[PDB]
Each structure stands twice: as structure tokens, then as C-alpha cells.
Amino acid sequence: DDGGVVNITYMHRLPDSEGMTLVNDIVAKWNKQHPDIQVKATKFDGKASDMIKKLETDVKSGEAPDLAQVGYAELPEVFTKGLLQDVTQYAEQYKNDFASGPYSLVQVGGKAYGLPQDTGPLVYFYNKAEFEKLGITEIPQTADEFIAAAKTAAAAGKYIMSYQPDEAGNMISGLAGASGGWYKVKGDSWVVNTETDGSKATADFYQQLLDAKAATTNPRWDPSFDASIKDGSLIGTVAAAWEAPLFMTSSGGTGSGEWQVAQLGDWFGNAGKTGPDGGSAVAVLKNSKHPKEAMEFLDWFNTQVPDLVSQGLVPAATTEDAETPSEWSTFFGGQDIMKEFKTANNNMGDFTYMPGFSAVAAKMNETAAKATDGSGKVADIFSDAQTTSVDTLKNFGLSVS
Template sequence: MDSTTPSTRRLLALATAAVVAFGGGACSSDENTSAAESGQSGPVNMEFWGWASYEKIVDQWNAAHPDSKVTFKKIPSGGKGGYTQITNAITAGEGPCLAQIEYQTIPSMLVKNTVMDITEYASADMAKYAPSAVSASSIDGKIYGVPVDVGPMVLFYRKDLFAKYGITEPPATWAEYKADAEKVAAADPSVKFGTAPAEGNDLAAFSLQTGQSWYSTQGDSWTVSIDNAGTRKVASFWQDLKDRGLVATTGNAWDPQFNKAATAGKVLSFVNASWAAGGLKSDLKDQSGKWAVAAMPTWEAGDGKSSSNGGSATSVMTGCETPREAAQFATFLSSDPQAVKEGIAGGLYPASKAGQDDSSLTAGDPYFGGQKVGDLYKASAEQVPTTWTNGPTYQQVETDFTEAIGQGTLPDAVTKVQASTVAAIKKLGLSVTDG
């Protein structure tokens, strides 16, 4: 049964032969049947490839499902070779049944015909997850992965340094953020209020908050709208702060330059996803109790809009002979309470709505002085726009943005990457409109 929509089929058909031609081991969507439907007898055996710490979750599944065994293989993260490894294996007819796929990479995997449409198996469970994660796992109304985690954006800030510079409350809007940055610079130009976006992933997260997407599909064509009003507003805002020396151009949590500046008391805050807390805890242990968390500043006072940076789904891969069982495992990984708890312990913030109320997230966090930071993460996750569409050439966009930001201004980078992305999609053999 071919469950793709006409629009999706056209997008796939427009891809070049080099992109979508796969070896004999890859099956079409006509073969997307369960073990029983395909006539397979005996226990189901499925491979699952990913880079997160999923071993204990797989063990839980196997203990409870003796007739459906999953074998987990740890691979490099997607951007560091994992996706290439997955694609090459599928081409050779030796790919996994399931794989960890970041949301932004799902479209490019679909264009390569490496992920299955699992709508018939997974749609009934989608209400369990944050709407933005469901949207990010879907294309053209079809589901290509079960959401695992999200990266709700918040403001991390130093309570002691805010007090030192007379900032009584964290900024609720970007206008207040700018005013606070000016206040700090007036007191000591060597101290930076925050950090500017340094690469494409950062800029995408800030743009997502505006509700304007970088891509859309119209009929049989992609439309690229990276150079939109929302993104240009974001780029101009941060470029102004950079030009005036109000923010640092280093990265943040896990970046050695940021750690050095933070240790010296030269940076007061940064805006990033919940997972960045792990960087603070691992690299700045001696600053425990000094950091706090607040809501991400908004463009309009009180609108509550937030954003997300990162996250992945569990996708069923082309060639899997037991997609129903694979989707069942994916749902278990994302929604079983104990499995979700293991994911949280491994540093994942769950896409599962129920998982966001896990006791490990609702308790006070000692690093943040006992603050219940999970409440802020949850509120942020609930306010992420669902209007964002990921595109089919994510790695190109990320690479081009990072290069362009290093060579010029953020607004110039937006213009350059708009053009290079249209060219890259054309090179894939897909129809594309310059939006």
C-alpha cells in the first residue's frame, strides 16, 4: 500500500537518480507490512541505531517483549557521520529497522527515501507529545518519526552578577534585554550581558520564535523563505548588539571561550535550550548556586512565545520488514514512564507531555539553587510555534550559515544562505521557489 500523498510522491519523484536510487535491500512503501502480514514467523528481531544512551531502554523493552527483540548499535551523532553510515547501510541492503533522526534532518532523509511513512501505526499516539515535536516529525501531514525529546529555550543567567549590575529582574522582552545589555556595558565595557548566535542552528532557533518558517511546500515544490521578515528582525537585533560590543561572540555552555569568560565574571547570561544546563553543570561546577533560569525573552510583552533548539525522533527506516513492531518500540521509547525516566537521566528533555511531569524534572535543581527549572522548561515547550517546516538540505544550511556569519554580518548571512539554499535544493533535482 502506498500511503504517501501525491505531493510527497512528487517531491520524491523530482529527486535525482543519484539521491533516491538504492540497493535491492531497500523496500518500497508497498512492503510496509507487519511481521504477521508479511508471513514472517517466529520472534521479531530489529536493529536500532543512534547516539543517545538508549541501552537501558532497549533492555527494558526486550525484557517485556520476548517475541520482539531490539538490538541497539551506538553510532556517531548524525552530523559527525551517523547519517552517512545509516544511508550507506540502507543502500547496501544492510540498514537498521529504526534510527535516531534529528527533526531538522527528517526531510533530507525522506528525499533520500530512507525513512518510512508510519502514520497508520503512530498517529493514534501523537497526542501524547508536545505539538511542536509532532509537527517537526511530520511532513505533508504524514508522520516520519515518533518524537523523543525537545530543546525548550530559556534564559540562563548569573543571579550574583545581575545583582552586581543592578538588574533586579531577568528581561522579559528583547527590548528589556537590550536595555540591560546597555546598562552593563555602561558600568564595565569588558563585561558582556549575553552571547550572540554564532551559527545556523542558533539563528534557526531564534527565528522559530517569530513564527515564520524558513521553508514550506506548495504543490510539488519547496519554497525557501530564509530571508523573511522574522529572521531579518532577529539578525538585525543581534548584529546591532554585536556592533556595539554589548554581547560576546563566543558560544555558550560547553564552549571553552564561554567557560573562561564565565569563570572571570565577564558574561552574565545566554539563551539556549534546556540541555545547555548540562554544560554548566559539567564545566562550571564551582558556580553551582550562582546560575538561575528564566523564560526566553519575547518580542511582544506577554505573548509567551518561546522556541526549541534540538531534539530527535525515532524513525522507521526503509527496508524494515516489521514497521508495525518498530513503531511500537518507538512509541515505548518515547512514552513508557520508565523509558522516559531513563532518557531524562541521560540528559534528554522529553517530548512526552506526561514525561515533562516526571518527578526528576519537577523537583528543585540544586545547581540552580533549588529552583524548579523544570517548570520553566515545560512552559517553554508548550509555547513553541508549530508553524516551522524543516527543509531537505539542513547540513548545507548549517554549514553555509556558520561560514557566512564568520565572514560578515548576520543580515548579510541571511541573504547569502537564502540564495545558496535555493541553489542546493535545485542541485538535488527538486522543484524550488525563491520565497
């Protein structure tokens, strides 16, 4: 048996903003109850996509935490780099606490490497009051009807869409992937096709918007993006569901009481489906000496539903219903937005991510930014991703058809 006190470290990249139940305050509850398993949680200092590079540095060092946040999209990559610990015999005990889809996303080859934490269905945020002022009385459901509406808004200095070049890897992959995967294993080899009907539909949608000057082009994480919500010019956009409290903070309050969440329209060849953008597991890393207790704490952590929801998460836990915080429904015109997130989740297409997808995402972002001044086409996002996907798999020493 272990000694009396086991010490566990947990690195996460949860927002921890004002108004939220801070992770350390969540962990303090556990620590008080469990002197036998003491937990130290720390928030990664840096840009989200850099976290797994730090984990890689730290695994090789032997200064890694026991537990770290790992995106579903990042799991096959960090797995392939040998950063994870097979914890199947422990995962199996907690399996029933979690929805079956997210639980399958912590597995590689029928072994489990942690526990799912949340999901990232793409939805549409919009200011309903501002739509009304523009005579937009319905969320337009076809790409053509949306583009027509967006030109009308644009001529009044308003935008019902944003193009986010720094998020093309995560958001635009999800939107295209809503209608079919880009990657599959066929026997001995990966088969890559990132130029699906969905990719073509998605490209055409954003291309028409950009050519009409009818979408903002501020990078999502730049102060210019918050400025667009604050100044009232950005009145509609695709968003991952976990964006809700972020968006609310970014706004400064502008539109409070008027914002609403809708399902994505059929704008991306998505035909009634949505796609994933983010959503993460927490993984047990290669050389953790305490997998059992790490997983014991993690099952507790990932079932603190109201506290996770405070961080904007759509929890993977099925142990209790997630509920819209009062603050959020207020901001969103009294709407129970969590019901929208759950609907979106249930309509979210599966998407296998190749190992090395970080490189595909990084390239997508780079090529996405070329489109904002007309130097590049939106479509080039998908043709470049195809080449980077194939090259990255080959760099990993993996076979590609």
C-alpha cells in the same frame, strides 16, 4: 508470524553523560522483559549534523539500523533522500501517547515515519547572583534595554549573551523563526524568504552585541565555551532547553545554586514567542524488516519519561508529567526549570524546514563565523541562507517560485 526472537537495532545521538540514565541501561530493562524483541542501541560517534550522512551511507549499503534519531528539521531531508519507512499503520496505535504538535512532525504528506521523542524550545539561562551584583534586577524585556545591560556587564568583564557561530544554523534560525516561517509550499513550488522581520531583528540584536564586544564568540562545542562558564565570565545566554545537563557539566559546578531559567525576552522580534532549536523524532528506516516491533519498542522507549528527562530531553510523551531532577533544581537555585521548559514549549512557533536544510544550516554557521572579527555582518547570515535555500531546493530537483 515472525520467529521467536526478533532483533532490532537503534542508533541514537543522546548525550549519555555521567549522571544520566544511560540509553543501554534503558534498553536493558526492555530486553529483560521482552526476549521476543531484543534491542541493540548504539550512540553515533561524531558531530550531531553528521549522523544523517552516516544513515545515508548505511541505507545505501544495507548496514542501516532499524531505528535512528532524526531531527524534526532533518526529517523532510532524509524523507526526500528515500531513507525512511512509512510506518503509518503502526504510529496510529501509539499516537495518543504523544503531544499532537511533535506527532505531526513525524509526518510527511499524512504518512508517519516514526515517533516524536522530544522538543527544543529556546530559553534563557542566567546567573541571578551575578546579575544582582551588576545591578541588573530584572531580565530586560526589550532589545534596547538588554543591549544597555549587556554593555554594563561587558565593562566588568562579564557576558550576559553568547554568540555561537557553530550553532547559528540551529539556534539563530529558531530565534528568527519564532516570529514566522522561512519556507512554505505554494501549490507546485516552494517559496523561500529567510529575511523576515524576525531575521532582521535577530541580526540587529547580535550585531549590536558583537560591535559592543558584549557577547562571547566562542563556538558552543569548543573547550573555550566551557571555560567561559567555569571562569565565571559567561553569566547569561540563550540555550535550547535540552542543554540543561550539558551546560551543568560544562560549568564544573561554577554558579551552582545561582543559575535560573527565564523565557526569552522580546529581543529577536519574537513578540512573546520562542522558536525551535533541535528536537528529534526516532524514525524507522527504509529497509527495516520489523517495523511493527521497532515501533512497539519505540513507543515504550519514548514513554520512559524520567529516563529521557535524565538525558536533558523535554519529552514529547504525554503519558506522565516530566519532572525536574533533584540535581537540576539544586544547580538552578531550587527552581523547577521543567515548568519553564513547558511554558516555552507551549509558546514555541511552528517552523517548516525545507528538505536540504542541513546545507542552509551549514552555510549559516560559516557566514556566522565571519562576523566574530568584523569581516562579515550578522545580517549576511540571512541573505546567504536565502541563496543557499533556493539553490539547495533546485539541486534536489524541486521547484522554487
